Symmetry: C2
Subunit: 145 residues, 2 copies
Amino acid sequence: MRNKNMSTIYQTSATASAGRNGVVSTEDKLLELNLSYPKEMGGSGTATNPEQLFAVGYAACFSNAILHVAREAKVALKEAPVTATVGIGPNGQGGFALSVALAAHIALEDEQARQLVTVAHQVCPYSNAVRGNIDVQVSVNGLAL
Amino acid sequence: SNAMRNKNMSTIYQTSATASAGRNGVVSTEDKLLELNLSYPKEMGGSGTATNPEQLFAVGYAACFSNAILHVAREAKVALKEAPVTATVGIGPNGQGGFALSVALAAHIALEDEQARQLVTVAHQVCPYSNAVRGNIDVQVSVNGLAL
């Protein structure tokens, strides 16, 4: 099954107590941030927020996954720029939902690029986490997957 | 998974970020509110000098879930001054050639027993990160040391 972490290779942890409006940090204090509401949600937009954090994390994870598959395919790829776009809105059941698009730009003939990025979307742990909940809109060199 | 409980019916807020990861990677939001360097952790072949997506997920989920608890408490007019949440995020191989995350959310709150179970249970239904991972990650939620 694509969901079971069968053996933990790396573990981290973080604590927050003021939700979207205060501090959050990894317990080892390696990553420490102030959070605030964006202007769109009535805030100052003076700091980051969980949607941005998810965008940054997923872009990074997906980029890493593409570079991983490239390595395994012995395809020299210097960079794998990924732009992640994350939205939030109400789900109509009283909760909230995320929407995600991922746009990868890769220096390979398009069918080869599609093959790499398609495999990467299978192996990426953020993709595995959200599969079936978020229909992630993935494109490669401007073409929809 | 439940696609309907994760339908964004009207976007309140949208944001973008672009990563050129690997090592030594960088990632930035389009508005520059967040600019970070990236590293693989030492446990996964890297230098662990900068941040990584599991840290980013831990921070995001801890904050989102703390907020969800505060949100429901407010709706319930249950006085909470704060809602401490520790999110623990692990990564390892799945059986199929990819990787999967494990998540635990430990709330440490001034409310107890079945009232607390009820409140944090609602929070876990409302929280957008919880809706995003439902069924895929068996998120291990606890309140004051006790399973949800």
